[PDB]
């Protein structure tokens, strides 16, 4: 060890960060009167309805 033959110095680093996300929301707060389309074998009713409103410009 007379010289710096044994003198040693070293550093090392490794950092990793990963992220991920997702969202999906929906809301509906109306009331619509529909009409029966047909009666199924079990008695369930197929209902279809439509409502058109022309407030102004569309």
């Amino acid at each position: 060890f007379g010289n710096s033959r044994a003198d040693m110095e070293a550093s090392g680093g490794n950092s990793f960060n990963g992220k991920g996300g997702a969202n999906a929301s929906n809301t509906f707060s109306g009331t619509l009167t529909v009409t029966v389309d047909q009666v199924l074998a079990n008695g369930n009713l197929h209902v279809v309805g439509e409502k058109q409103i022309a407030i102004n410009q569309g």
Partner: protein, 58 residues
């Protein structure tokens, strides 16, 4: 429909066309952590700064 229908039962779906209501209310959460460390430190010294006449040889 001529099928038999119970009166006091909870009207669960029973056939192909029957409809059921599903409340998702799904909530899953998983976490994982790990750590490790290792530290070693050493430091040695020795010095006279004054040597006896009889020990000057060594």
């Amino acid at each position: 429909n001529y099928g038999y229908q119970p009166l006091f039962e909870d009207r669960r779906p029973r056939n192909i066309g029957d409809t059921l209501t599903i409340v998702l209310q799904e909530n899953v959460s998983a976490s994982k952590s790990s750590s490790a460390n290792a530290s070693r430190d050493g430091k040695t010294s020795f010095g006279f700064d004054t040597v006896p006449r009889y020990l000057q040889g060594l």
